[PDB]
């Protein structure tokens, strides 16, 4: 149960580029860096899994959600 300022610092790790959203490409980079080589399809699966609103990307509120466990 991190605090809101705690979860935003972590969020910024994923959100490499400017904008406050995590794209599939930024997620593929994080995963490769953290030891997991994944396909475009696996990456799409992870983004879908977290993409509540269905816009193709993970925003801040959606991040806050599942980073529960």
């Amino acid at each position: 149960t991190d605090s809101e300022e705690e979860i935003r610092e972590a969020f910024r790790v994923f959100d490499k580029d400017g904008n406050g959203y995590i794209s599939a490409a930024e997620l593929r980079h994080v995963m490769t860096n953290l030891g997991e080589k994944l396909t475009d399809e696996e990456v799409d699966e992870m983004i879908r899994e977290a993409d509540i609103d269905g816009d193709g990307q993970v925003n801040y509120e959606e991040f806050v959600q599942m980073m529960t466990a």
Binding site: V13, V30, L34
Partner: peptide
């Protein structure tokens, strides 16, 4: 996979 991603950034920061 998301779990290590969360843990990775959480450690990084």
């Amino acid at each position: 996979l998301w779990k290590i991603a969360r843990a990775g950034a959480r450690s990084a920061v």
